[PDB]
Design a protein that fits this description.
Two copies of one chain form a homodimer. Chain A is an alpha+beta fold and 563 residues long. Chain A contains 16 helices and 18 strands. Bound molecules: ligand 01K (2 copies) and zinc ion (ZN) (7 copies). Chains A, B: Its main location: cytoplasm.
Chain lengths: 563, 563
């Protein structure tokens, strides 16, 4: 019901238009309508379907042809966009248009906020990286050229010509079907699509606002979105967000971890700090099956179990930033209890761990990650797990372990840095008398005097079961030939962590998890959360997006159980 | 003297050569000598004046032709650049070489420190931009084509071709007459010159180690450089550096500022922190002379003083990092005491202010800057100065206020940030009862009810003297027509800080500096330090470089006073 008078707009908007005029000599190609004849370029109007310049925008602002502020922002970007679509990253017009937008990004935000809006940015989702289907490590970066069929199966232009002739094997994904598709049936594409961010309208104002900015979810507030401005003018606020990190069900594991982190934070008494919530959101019983090579060498002759049972758990840590939950750490673990046979007995394995670097304060981020991890080791140690195993291997270019689409400026560690990061955490744990000691897989195997692949712990998704299949094949049926060699080669990447050692490790009681099972398909393994994020445009790439993603993650965790 | 056994060099260096070999398929074009025939590229043996590859480097490392480890590092980088030059970054060959180099960067550093060297990086100083002579604001970027006479006068590609007639008038540079020079007598260069870092030999072991890495100065330790290892082999260490930041002569002002900062760090109790040393390294008395325009309008009239006397000071803050001094902040001020006629009477002005972002801990950096600023404003108040002035404006791209060549990842704030930065600093000083109030120049002029330009503080180098020249000139003789308008246009950038408000001004005691004069040509204004740095290749671009520059800066300060 809010009416905007054409003179209250120019009162607010014109300053930021003038600030674009005032840039000598950067605004020249924009000050008056582009005239293709007067610059000799007949291929202009055919490339720019609807053009814009500075005076056209000014005329509309002076006459009164802008109903609402976004129309003015939209034209301003239209003008920039045409200008980028013609010139290259190399010319002068481009450089100029960059400057104006750069200047405009600066002025528009306060002004738009003056008018009662969330911001003044034009916001879109940069094209995600896709999975090349040929190599299995192959990746498709933004702007690259790729081939799709039914928008499922995409191929990197290199991988695609590495195919035999014109017939492509495809859809080997679920079950038996080997549907064979011809090359002619594919779409040649550029991974360059830009989806805009969505707006939500205020049911009292009428103002378009960025969904992600105002954090409005249809499930949490089904009455409809009411902007802060309107809420303040009636001395009221939003309903409580019942779907919070804090209100996720508690478990002993979570309570233990968060107490540790929070106690740690208190002793620091650092001023930017806020309390950390830790929640276990998945817990289920699984079995890993020994693969066919190792099964035929060791299982069929009864030297090794055909499978090992383990519990898998997914846990996340959250912090309140600007009065809103943000998810900053995640981890999936595998726990092989006392009922599991050798050699996996009483071992825990960290499948995957991951983070988004928005924890406040930056100063204590690493230390908190170390605290959560050391705390996990301390928990399972008390219950009776004797040993922990960690495969320290950073994700490859544009892969994400748990959180879809990280911030562009959250550097990923190289192997050395990651290995030293783990050595630091474990050294801490060694000095608190929690971890007894640790060694790389090779020094450990020597220590334990092992002589056969069958003595190596065998975890779901780990590196060793795969290399053992190759070992047995390549060596003609042996299970020891290149074992110590392979262990040397990769040694500094494979941490083996002794929580309980010596004679003490032999006369221990049964391991009992006081926590109950927690079914939750969304976090059974890591692929579902990644898919959910890919599917719903969730990103962890900026604080505001991480906040919204977190908000959605929670709504999913809460509405999955209740039915 | 340490000749290396050829065996020492194989069992240390091969792991890094094998690491490059291990890269399938990224080392394929580098495995064999480039036989231009087999490929289909004729011009190889003319552009690459010497080819290099992994087979040849393997040959030498096995036959012991490598005398010292740096030859191996050169050949590795010989090979990389050869391939990096012949292709552009578009191709496949170039990308491959880039992965290779990153692998080598990751492998070589531990290996070289095992061989007793500082590091294994190949280091050079990237060219700095140069002043174009034509526009007098024109600039020559790295890699841009340009023209030069002697090594003094340079011209951008376009500027040079935009002087018609084929003769150039160089010699605006001195106050000596205007010579003229042919166009044939200029050199066509490219700005692609890279200077290697210098090495220093150890007088015992004989290894080349990077000067900047081991911080050896001919003047500090004139009995030759001895490496860290050789000192550790003799149960002895380097003679105490007598040219420290700490041993710079103290001042009552210096001591006041550092006592504030260090009390501040003690109260914070943050476990990363080092002590801060503030020293004033320049104090000279000067006078700013009213420029021609205003001189004619107001001075000859008898309405305002022809020139104002001020004291100028330069003060730097240092921190101990890895046991070495690092200069991290710098400020020049202009102090207009009680002997100074209006309107400048009892006003301080911050000429310039700069920083290098390596202060530990990061999370206290901004606070410490503020404590220094709030400390200065508190010191001048207690001395009897009523009013401080700050021209909040960040440096242009590629420009440096005080420290030459900043780190590439030290973001420079945009105006709205820098403005908010001074507000946070001031609000704290108002919280602390030190600053009474502060306002923008336009609101302050309105309160003081000013009516004429003769009433505005006239500071050396500040924005207003220049703009007042232009205003009188364009208005045809008027002293104050655009005045309030001009002040309004830039209000947000000119801070007016009131230290003593109201009645006090009428009869405060005279202002006396308890500190003596510190003559120091190097720190008289900002140009001499920038110039020294540009001349001696001093940079503040990394921790190691910034440390070396601090060492030289400190040597230069210590050896002007003494003869
Ligand atoms: C099947 C198969 O084949 N392969 C595999 C099998 C998978 C095995 C799974 N194994 C595991 O899951 C256990 S190890 C994996 C670790 N997880 C990740 O790495 C995910 C992404 N990384 C992160 O979330 C964080 O980086 C984290 C590792 C949590 C630590 O963050 P941090 O903040 O405590 O330290 P920092 O990151 O070094 O940064 C701390 C400082 O170092 C800086 N820094 C970091 N990296 C770099 C760099 N590369 N260059 C320069 N600086 C750099 C960073 O900027 C920063 O500065 P500051 O704090 O001053 O701002 C598969 N399934 O795909
Ligand atoms: C003649 C004429 O026409 N014109 C002029 C006339 C001269 C007038 C002279 N006036 C003055 O001397 C007074 S104005 C002060 C200007 N001095 C400088 O600007 C030197 C370069 N800048 C700095 O040394 C520092 O930035 C400093 C100003 C000390 C503040 O450092 P900081 O660290 O406390 O705050 P932060 O930098 O904002 O950073 C604080 C956070 O904000 C971040 N940040 C900073 N800038 C940006 C940015 N642009 N974009 C995004 N993020 C950004 C930064 O990375 C960071 O994150 P974190 O702490 O999590 O890492 C002439 N003569 O040429
Ligand atoms: Zn918004
Ligand atoms: Zn491909
Ligand atoms: Zn509203
Ligand atoms: Zn801190
Ligand atoms: Zn070095
Ligand atoms: Zn030029
Ligand atoms: Zn030596």
């Amino acid at each position: 019901k809010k009416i905007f008078k054409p003179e209250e707009l120019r009162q607010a908007l014109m300053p930021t238009l003038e600030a674009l005029y005032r840039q000598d000599p950067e605004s020249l190609p924009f000050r008056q309508p582009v005239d293709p004849q007067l610059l000799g370029i007949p291929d202009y109007f055919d490339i720019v379907k609807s053009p814009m310049d500075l005076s056209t925008i000014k005329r509309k602002l002076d006459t009164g042809q802008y109903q609402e502020p976004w129309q003015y922002v939209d034209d301003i970007w239209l003008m920039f966009n045409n200008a980028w679509l013609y010139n290259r990253k190399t010319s002068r017009v481009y450089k100029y248009c960059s400057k104006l937008s750069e200047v405009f990004e600066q002025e528009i935000d306060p002004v738009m906020q003056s008018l009662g809006y969330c911001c003044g940015r034009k916001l879109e989702f940069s094209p995600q990286t896709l999975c090349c289907y040929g190599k299995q490590l192959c990746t498709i970066p933004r702007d690259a050229t790729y081939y799709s069929y039914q928008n499922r199966y995409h191929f990197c232009e290199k991988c695609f010509n590495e195919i035999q002739g014109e017939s492509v094997s495809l859809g080997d994904d679920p079950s038996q079907p080997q549907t064979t598709i011809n090359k002619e049936q594919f779409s040649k594409r550029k991974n360059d699509t830009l989806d805009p961010e969505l707006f939500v309208e205020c049911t009292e104002c009428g103002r378009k606002m960025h969904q992600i900015c105002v954090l409005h979810h249809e499930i949490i507030w089904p009455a409809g979105f009411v902007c802060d401005g309107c809420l303040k003018k009636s001395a009221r606020t939003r309903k409580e967000n019942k779907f919070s990190a804090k209100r996720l069900p508690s478990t002993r594991l979570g309570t233990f971890l968060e107490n540790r982190v929070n106690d740690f934070l208190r002793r620091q008494n650092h001023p930017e700090s806020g309390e950390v919530t830790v929640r276990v959101v998945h817990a289920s019983d699984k079995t890993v099956e020994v693969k066919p090579g190792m099964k035929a060498r060791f299982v069929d002759s009864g030297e090794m179990a055909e499978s090992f049972p383990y519990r898998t758990k997914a846990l996340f840590a959250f912090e309140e930033i600007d009065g809103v939950d943000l998810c900053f750490f995640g981890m999936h673990v595998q726990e092989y209890g006392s009922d599991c046979p050798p050699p996996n007995q009483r071992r825990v394995y960290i499948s995957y761990l991951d983070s988004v670097h928005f924890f406040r304060p930056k100063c204590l981020r690493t230390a908190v990650y170390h605290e959560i991890l050391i705390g996990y080791l301390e928990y399972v140690k008390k219950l009776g797990y004797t040993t922990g195993h960690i495969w320290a291997c950073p994700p490859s270019e544009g892969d994400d372990y748990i959180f879809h689409c990280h911030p562009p400026d959250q550097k990923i560690p190289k192997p050395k840095r990651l290995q030293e990061w783990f050595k630091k955490m474990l050294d801490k744990a060694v000095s608190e008398r929690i971890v007894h000691d640790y060694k790389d897989i090779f020094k450990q195997a020597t220590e334990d005097r092992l002589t056969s692949a069958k003595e190596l712990p065998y975890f779901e998704g780990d590196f060793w079961p795969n290399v053992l299949e190759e070992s047995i094949k390549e060596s003609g049926g042996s299970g020891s030939q290149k074992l110590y060699a392979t262990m040397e080669k990769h040694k500094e990447v494979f941490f083996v962590i002794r929580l309980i050692a010596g004679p003490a490790a032999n006369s221990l009681p049964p391991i009992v998890d006081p926590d109950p099972l927690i079914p939750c398909d969304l976090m059974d393994g890591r692929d579902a959360f990644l898919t959910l994020a890919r599917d719903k445009h969730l990103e962890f790439s900026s604080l505001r997006r991480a906040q919204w993603s977190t908000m959605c993650m929670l709504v999913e965790l809460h509405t999955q159980s209740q039915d």
